[PDB]
Paper text:
By homology, E88 acts as a nucleophile, forming a glycosidic bond with the donor substrate. Our data show that CtNDTE88A is catalytic inactive, as expected, but CtNDTE88Q retains some catalytic activity, albeit the catalytic efficiency in comparison to the wild type is reduced by almost 50-fold. We used the inactive mutant CtNDTE88A to isolate the substrate binding step, the less active mutants CtNDTE88Q and CtNDTD62N to determine the involvement of each of these residues in binding and/or 2′-deoxyribosylation, and a wild-type enzyme to obtain boundaries for the magnitude of the rate constant for the 2′-deoxyribosylation reaction. The association rate constant for 2′-deoxyadenosine binding (obtained with CtNDTE88A) was 0.76 ± 0.01 μM–1 s–1 with a dissociation rate constant of 39.3 ± 0.7 s–1. kcat/KM-2′Ado-25°C = 0.016 μM–1 s–1 (determined with the saturating concentration of nucleobase) sets a lower boundary for this bimolecular association step. Stopped-flow data were used with enzyme variants CtNDTE88A to estimate the rates of 2′-deoxyadenosine binding and release, wild-type CtNDT to obtain the rate of 2′-deoxyribosylation, and CtNDTD62N to obtain the rate of 2′-deoxyribosyl hydrolysis.
Here, we characterize the structure and function of a thermophilic dNDT, the protein from Chroococcidiopsis thermalis (CtNDT). Nucleoside 2′-deoxyribosyltransferase (dNDT) enzymes catalyze transglycosylation via a covalent 2′-deoxyribosylated enzyme intermediate with retention of configuration, having applications in the biocatalytic synthesis of 2′-deoxynucleoside analogues in a single step. The reaction catalyzed by dNDT proceeds via a ping-pong mechanism, with the formation of a 2′-deoxyribosyl-enzyme intermediate covalently linked to an active-site glutamate.13 Transglycosylation occurs in a stereospecific manner, preserving the anomeric carbon in the β configuration in the newly formed 2′-deoxyribonucleoside. As with other NDT enzymes, the active site of CtNDT is formed by residues from two monomers, and therefore, it is only fully formed in the dimer/tetramer.
Numbering used by the authors:
A (entry chain B), D (entry chain C): 1 to 154
B (entry chain D): 3 to 154
C (entry chain A): 2 to 152
Write the structure that this text describes.
């Protein structure tokens, strides 16, 4: 009955249009699985951007959310994936959080032939079956055959 | 010897690997640091096997876990994603953090720092600049955090 | 003849961005009387099962830039998209009208005068280039900016 | 062999170490073919960077060099290739300059399966034989079986 907490890491807060139009459908798909979504652009609405220390406070606030999530859902679109998202993904791998990756961007940005992206993004995923954690469309988030659903049900 | 994980995108180009990395390695070794540079350290991995990518990732993860600090080359627009994953690991594991950027361009989401604020989450609010190196010649500096960290 | 805008963007690469972000921009331009040439839609006819599809898309995009009246370049991202940048360089060298769009508040710059790499502004005047630089979809139809005046 | 003019577009001037160590070998490889190299970071050292209009002056100078060159030699390393290089490449394609591409970066940043990079970089290259204009190592620049050399001897 306690909802699992997902940190929703994305570059979508940087573009006015992307923040308005791309994130809400992703948040809704995750919430339809029963997830408690911590999305940092929304959770940092409160922070007083008129202070000189706002960037440091956002950094610490995001760090605490990653430490206290149960898993990360990392939007890794872009060439290359966003550096903020990557730092958060690294934190979550090191803290043994559950890892889920989302990329509906069909371009390749890779240093290898096994994975569609730089191999470091998959260090927290299994050698076999990592594709089950790798979502390629918003429509796929609901899938009972993929790893987010299975994680929530055991 | 304190151990530094030297994260960089410099293994990706023939020239960068042979020309850019050794000067940085030498500058760190001249401080008495044992340098763990992943492109060199994973040279014994068999790149004819399908699982080589997985083994590099696991080896890199273990080196981050076992290092004492990360020295992260964060050049580029934006910084390299593999360097960033490694930086994130190091922050979460409470490793010492040192950043290197001799790229004068800005790739930032704020005005306080020259780069995305998440890179500085493992550095102090005041004096983070002491951990931020902007030239190979500055690495040896007695007044910057790497030296103080070794002699502290 | 309606004026023709080549709408260059990285938005066709992401399924969601293609669906949600491009139609509002197309509509804002068309509401000004513009005929919009958006290459991901214009190249939909190409047979992507054939090995020459990438060459045919490149030549189609090149011809569209040659035949447009101006480019409206979505230069979001860190850095701006390389496909959009090649089209922009083409448009600049061909004396097409240049309009830039960035609603990404991040900075990817090599100078202090402009918010982006200085080469993106090579086709814009020294004074008043900000009039050609759009930072929101709402601002596209500003009767005070360069697109409206150009029309 | 003719002494043709090559605009050497690269991102290497942005990093102190790369400007010092990566750019001169490429300049020398081109000069070793008898080419007159126009390298913009060096060519704009004349400009007064204490004036507010220095960025405008560098852009116009670069634009003029692309107009007046015979070909571009574009260093298209990085994920993605550098945006200033890409604008210059676009200018050169539309001005029917000769086009030569250099990438010794072994990562892929591509939107297709025919080319190793975004297809727009190859719009001014032939459908068949574009590989002869595509260089993947400094040592290869001198090859008389590739298009730079043959362009000089025609």
């Amino acid at each position: 009955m306690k909802r699992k907490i997902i940190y929703l890491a994305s570059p979508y807060g940087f573009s006015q249009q992307q923040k308005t139009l791309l994130l809400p459908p992703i948040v809704r798909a995750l919430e339809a699985l029963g997830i408690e979504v911590w999305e940092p652009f929304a959770r940092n609405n409160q922070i007083d951007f008129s202070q000189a220390d706002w960037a440091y406070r956002v950094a610490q606030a995001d760090l605490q959310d990653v430490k206290n999530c149960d898993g990360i859902f990392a939007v890794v679109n872009g060439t290359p994936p966003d550096e903020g998202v990557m730092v958060a993904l690294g934190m979550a791998i090191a803290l043994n959080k559950a890892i889920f990756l989302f990329r509906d961007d069909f371009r390749r940005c890779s240093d290898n032939e096994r994975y569609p992206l730089n191999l470091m993004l998959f260090a927290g995923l299994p050698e076999i079956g990592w594709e089950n954690y790798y979502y390629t469309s918003v429509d796929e988030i609901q899938s009972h055959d993929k790893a987010l659903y299975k994680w929530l049900t055991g």
